[PDB]
């Protein structure tokens, strides 16, 4: 009966994670929408390039802010891991069988 457990654990990987990734395909066209270059003249393209470059700066700043919170959590995780640790305080059979038994090793 426990080895039915391993099957269902394998199905659960084989799982929800995949569905959550898909639910991400749904998130993603909801933030980064398609470009519209058709019908923009030379000047308009120069301005767009400047607009996009400015956006690069803004998004990098937002990324930095989330990164800074992640960094502070790492420091906290490292400290708590030490605290709980304190409070709580070759050769494979295959190769071995071939060497010891020579030809007589078939099945193993």
């Amino acid at each position: 009966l426990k080895t039915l457990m391993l099957q269902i654990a394998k199905q659960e990987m084989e799982r929800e994670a995949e569905e959550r990734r898909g639910e991400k395909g749904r998130v993603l066209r909801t933030r980064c929408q398609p470009l519209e270059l058709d019908g923009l003249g030379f000047e308009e393209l120069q301005d767009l390039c400047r607009q996009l470059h400015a956006r690069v700066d803004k998004v990098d700043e937002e990324r930095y802010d989330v990164e800074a919170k992640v960094t502070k959590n790492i420091t906290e995780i490292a400290d708590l891991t030490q605290k709980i640790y304190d409070l709580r305080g070759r050769i494979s059979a295959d190769a071995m069988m071939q060497a010891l038994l020579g030809t007589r090793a078939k099945e193993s």
Partner: protein, 150 residues
């Protein structure tokens, strides 16, 4: 233990016969017909390895089930099979942990088991908890959960 025991149940007779022939090489000349650090060291060195006495003792302790300090054939089979994601279970753990205390208790286990739709006997619940709870506090912590679902 459980995953190793299951592997043992599934060795064929001829596989076990070959392992017995290997075991006989290990124990040749041993007083009690078992593998001590003396026999284990001799064979490891014959095989080209150089374990320390501490590594040798640890190899024996890993599979010694009767505290004999030695390896009998049954313990040898386990040694042989032993010789040969977490992020994913961390998210699932949180789903069991309904009061968010970092442990899965009996009530939480019961709730989850009933939600499966299978007929859940009292024995189903008690044995799963005993299987999961390695340190006898009556609950399944994160590390126990990982082993429990390994």
């Amino acid at each position: 233990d459980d995953i190793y025991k299951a592997a043992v149940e599934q060795l064929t007779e001829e596989q076990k016969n070959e392992f017995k022939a290997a075991f006989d090489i290990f124990v040749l000349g041993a007083e009690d017909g078992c593998i001590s650090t003396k026999e284990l060291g001799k064979v490891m060195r014959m095989l080209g390895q150089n374990p320390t006495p501490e590594e040798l003792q640890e190899m024996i302790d890993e599979v010694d089930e009767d505290g004999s300090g030695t390896v009998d054939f049954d313990e040898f089979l386990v040694m042989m099979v032993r010789c040969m994601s977490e992020e994913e279970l961390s998210d699932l753990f949180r789903m069991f942990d309904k009061n968010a205390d970092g442990y899965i208790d009996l009530d939480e286990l019961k709730m989850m088991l009933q939600a499966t739709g299978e007929t859940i006997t009292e024995d189903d619940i008690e044995e799963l908890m005993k299987d999961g709870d390695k340190n006898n506090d009556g609950r399944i912590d994160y590390d126990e959960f990982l082993e429990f679902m390994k």
